[PDB]
Design a binder for this molecule. Structure first.
Ligand SMILES: [Zn+2]
Lengths: 101, 136, 213, 67, 83, 25
RNA sequence: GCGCAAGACGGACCAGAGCGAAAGCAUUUGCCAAGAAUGUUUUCAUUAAUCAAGAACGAAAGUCGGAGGUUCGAAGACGAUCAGAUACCGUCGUAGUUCCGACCAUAAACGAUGCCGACCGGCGAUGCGGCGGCGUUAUUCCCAUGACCCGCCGGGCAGCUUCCGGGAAACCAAAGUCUUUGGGUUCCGGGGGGAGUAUGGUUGCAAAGCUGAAACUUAAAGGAAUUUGGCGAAGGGCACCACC
């Protein structure tokens, strides 16, 4: 039984792409098949941001962020509840969930 | 053993490295040039249990040790230099760096520019493991 | 066992007149024991700073490498060694669905100072644009890289280190880059990301005194 | 550890849902009357009606969800 | 369309279509003539030159080879001829 | 019963039969 | 933290994007050679399509000779896990991994769908080249130039929808134009095991690659989808025969 419209990745005219490595795993999943994440994280999220700011010598100093990205294998991503399964009638929904915060 | 800088005029500025992996926490402090050090402390200094090597309490105790050492030496303002693991293993640091920095800010020191000095490669050699991964 | 802070001196360095703020920090070297002089121990030192610690009130996300050259007692004289941006700014300016252009020329100055200037460039998305892709062809990037290398190697080979640094404290090379490269494809973000030094001439003292005034 | 905790008083206004491993810890939103600018969220075990004064001895850290 | 008449549509319909999908078969390019502003002799040139051409008398080059139609030298008067 | 290790073991017995037929003279 | 030295690789930029017959291909620069598409009122004039013989290329792993081999890492060595592990896990670790030659021609080398050519609907996008048309950007006026926008043309990866139509259904704008059955052409299969097995030939130093049985047993082996199952699957709600 064929499952999807595509083959499950972003290979449609190439045949082979470069392999990448997972973060919590080490599987050599291809780049067009894996799951990426462009996460933005501050140095202090909500824990002691006022304690950091009031201890700062420089007036009007803003904390920087950490723009790092991670690569997940499919089993590693489904174990960490990153992606979730759904039904067949809504499986053709490429649109991401909405962003608010 | 004592510095000629006055505690009423301005504050001195050193740099301190924090290396915070998923199972180890280093808190090291050196001079501004980085040639010579001041003191150093790991997570597993007083807590002899291995399981607390990556814990908020060990990082908090390490930051208190740096706090007491820098207060008896007279070092007030610090630049925090954060390192996650180094190399091609991971990129996101653990939760020990957060507790170490908030315990440094809790004691009473002053902070300046903070940044990340993680040795990011262009791309390194083969990762420690196999093709199928570190399954468990 | 015993604290060696009894044998611990306290020295200070001085920024050149090419900057504005003279004092940047302090160092803690040990004493002199005849066979172990502390004069050479102050030689091999690189000081890491920011822009607001040296110049006046403007934006500050750049770093400067400062290496000492000679000491005579209770003071140190330094000089330019390298320049670099912030890693946070570098990893923030990398945008998805935008291309990046880089170039380098090992350009030699008037004196024996040899540098290695790096450059980076990102294209500009227009306000009228509806297409989200906004890429450029390979020959466009090649000609942009050729113009960038020629402009960057023209401004360094004609002058000494102090003049090109004083041109490098504001954005003059970058202002020339988005002045001259917008005729082929509009780009908005060019910083000199890193300047690496390779070789120096014979060591002297008049240059070291004249960079401080 | 040499920390001092001054006596500060709180008064609840809104109550959030009831958390915990077995489901007994209650998340509440307090409002100080020493100053009308600081509100902290903690865990309380017991009946709390909205608009009732609450006792505190230390206030520097918030509360997690379950563990 | 059901009863789409392909005998004689509007000329815009044959204009928008391809040169070979057109039901009466005819190309789109044409012949032209153009002179030099400081000369008397005027010569003819095809719309797609594919070689660089100069006007007679060996005074000033006239056209330039492009992927499409040949672009003319600035400041030259011309008109399309037809028969 | 999958085909890979079945084919591997049966290739091993193929090689054993080949060497036995070689040295059977 | 500062220098020296070796080897490997070129992240983020990198996309349901490009190129190539496929296997495959990402630091800049310099040289050589080839090619799709676009445009053409240029030239030869049937040079055409598919192909038994035969031929080229071909991921990794494998064998023969070398300088040199960072990191990772078959077989193996040492500890914990385990009723029992010579498995998962950790530390070392040889052959290998990279380069120059010499070879076998095997993958889920899969779009599990041969090539050419004609036809049958739409929508909005991206990539190349050409084309027409408001208005902005390279010291304020024109021109074509690079970019922005609105439409058209040809080829390619495509996406959405469609009682066109097809199919056992999954699904397909081809897997359609088929009992209303014939466009041209190459390879290839008749219930399931035995068995890609033995023999024979063939190539190879080497592993094996190609070719390819018989006896006997067997009435099922298989493909699609539905109904409550049953999940150390996910997500909601309830119970003091559950908990606080
Ligand atoms: Zn994983």
């Amino acid at each position: 039984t064929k499952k999807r419209r595509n083959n499950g990745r972003a290979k449609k005219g190439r045949g082979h792409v470069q392999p990448i490595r997972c973060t919590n795993c080490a599987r050599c999943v291809p780049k067009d098949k894996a799951i990426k994440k462009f996460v933005i994280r501050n140095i202090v999220e909500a824990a002691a941001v006022r304690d950091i700011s009031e201890a700062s010598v420089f007036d009007a100093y803003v904390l920087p962020k950490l723009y790092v990205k991670l690569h997940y294998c499919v089993s590693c991503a489904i174990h960490s509840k990153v992606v979730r399964n759904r039904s067949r009638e809504a499986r053709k929904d490429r649109t991401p969930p909405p962003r608010f915060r | 053993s004592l510095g000629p800088q006055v505690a009423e005029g301005e504050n001195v500025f050193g740099v301190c490295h924090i290396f915070a992996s998923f199972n180890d926490t280093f808190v090291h402090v050196t001079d501004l040039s980085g040639k010579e050090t001041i003191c150093r402390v790991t997570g597993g200094m007083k807590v002899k249990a291995d399981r607390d090597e990556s814990s908020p309490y060990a990082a908090m105790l390490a930051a208190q040790d740096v706090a007491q050492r820098c207060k008896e030496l007279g070092i007030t303002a610090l630049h925090i230099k954060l390192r996650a693991t180094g190399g091609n293993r991971t990129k996101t640091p653990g939760p020990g760096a957060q507790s170490a920095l908030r315990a440094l800010a809790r004691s009473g020191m002053k902070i300046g520019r903070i940044e990340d000095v993680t040795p990011i490669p262009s791309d390194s050699t083969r990762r420690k493991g196999g093709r199928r991964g570190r399954r468990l | 066992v015993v604290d060696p802070f009894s044998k611990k001196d306290w020295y200070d360095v001085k920024a050149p007149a090419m900057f504005n703020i003279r004092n940047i920090g302090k160092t803690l070297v040990t004493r002199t024991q005849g066979t172990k002089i502390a004069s050479d121990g102050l030689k091999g030192r690189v000081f890491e700073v920011s822009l607001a610690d040296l110049q006046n009130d403007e934006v500050a996300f750049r770093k400067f490498k400062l290496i000492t050259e000679d000491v005579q007692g209770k003071n140190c004289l330094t000089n330019f060694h390298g320049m670099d941006l912030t890693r946070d700014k570098m990893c923030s300016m990398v945008k998805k669905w935008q291309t990046m252009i880089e170039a380098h020329v090992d350009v030699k100055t008037t004196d024996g100072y040899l540098l290695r200037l790096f450059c980076v460039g990102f294209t500009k998305k227009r306000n009228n644009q509806i297409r989200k892709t906004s890429y450029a062809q390979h020959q466009q990037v090649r000609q942009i890289r050729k113009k960038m290398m020629e402009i960057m190697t023209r401004e360094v080979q004609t002058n000494d280190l102090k003049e090109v640094v004083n041109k490098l404290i504001p954005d003059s090379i970058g202002k020339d880059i988005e002045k001259a490269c917008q005729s082929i494809y509009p780009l908005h973000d060019v910083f000199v990301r890193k300047v690496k030094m390779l070789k120096k001439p014979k060591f002297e003292l008049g240059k070291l005194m004249e960079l401080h005034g | 550890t040499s920390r001092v905790q001054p006596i500060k008083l709180a008064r609840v206004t809104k109550v959030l849902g009831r958390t915990g491993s077995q489901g007994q810890c209650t998340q509440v939103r307090v409002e100080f009357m020493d100053d009308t600018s600081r509100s902290i969220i903690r865990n309380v075990k017991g009946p709390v009606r909205e608009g009732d004064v609450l006792t505190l001895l230390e206030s520097e850290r918030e509360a997690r969800r379950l563990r | 369309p059901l009863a789409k008449d392909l005998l004689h549509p509007s000329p815009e319909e044959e204009k928008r279509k391809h040169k070979k999908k057109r039901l009466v078969q005819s190309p789109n390019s044409y012949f032209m003539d153009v002179k030099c502003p400081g000369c008397y002799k005027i010569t003819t040139v095809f719309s797609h030159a594919q070689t660089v051409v100069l006007c007679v008398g060996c005074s000033t080059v006239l056209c330039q080879p492009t992927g499409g139609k040949a672009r003319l030298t600035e400041g030259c008067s011309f008109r399309r001829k037809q028969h | 019963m999958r085909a890979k290790w079945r084919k591997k073991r049966m290739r091993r017995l193929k090689r054993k039969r080949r060497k036995m037929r070689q040295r059977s003279k």
